[PDB]
Design a protein around this ligand. Structure first.
Ligand code: NA
Length: 129
């Protein structure tokens, strides 16, 4: 599913991401834009041989099982394929664990390099939330 901007903003809010670990909804929408372009089916191979899955490009090195990431963990206890669903419940549940792990949203290098410190409110502009 390719979410619309406000569509994804509504879904993330409904799933309790708005101000989760102090991150406003626009931070999460911004992260999703630069990680996946709001595409639930996005997959990207990392140089270390792990893969990033779904709207928030959750990494098989630590968070989900894809059966092809040696010495990896599955801390969200989910198949990485579950992170490609049109229903973002699994991605959001797993992202709550990631953002809680100590470095907040710096876990998402695209967030740190493209969203952090910017006018992230712009990403929920015009949305009926
Ligand atoms: Na894994």
């Amino acid at each position: 599913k390719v979410f619309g901007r406000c569509e994804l903003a509504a879904a993330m809010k409904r799933h309790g991401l708005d101000n989760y670990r102090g991150y406003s909804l626009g931070n999460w929408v911004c992260a999703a834009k630069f990680e996946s372009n709001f595409n639930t089916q996005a997959t990207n191979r990392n140089t270390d041989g792990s893969t990033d899955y779904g709207i928030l490009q959750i990494n098989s090195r630590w968070w989900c099982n894809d059966g092809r990431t040696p010495g990896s963990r599955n801390l969200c206890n989910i198949p990485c394929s579950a992170l490609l669903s049109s229903d973002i419940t699994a991605s959001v549940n797993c992202a709550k664990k990631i953002v809680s792990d100590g470095n907040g949203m710096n876990a998402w290098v695209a967030w740190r390099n493209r969203c952090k410190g910017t006018d992230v409110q712009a990403w929920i502009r015009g949305c009926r939330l």
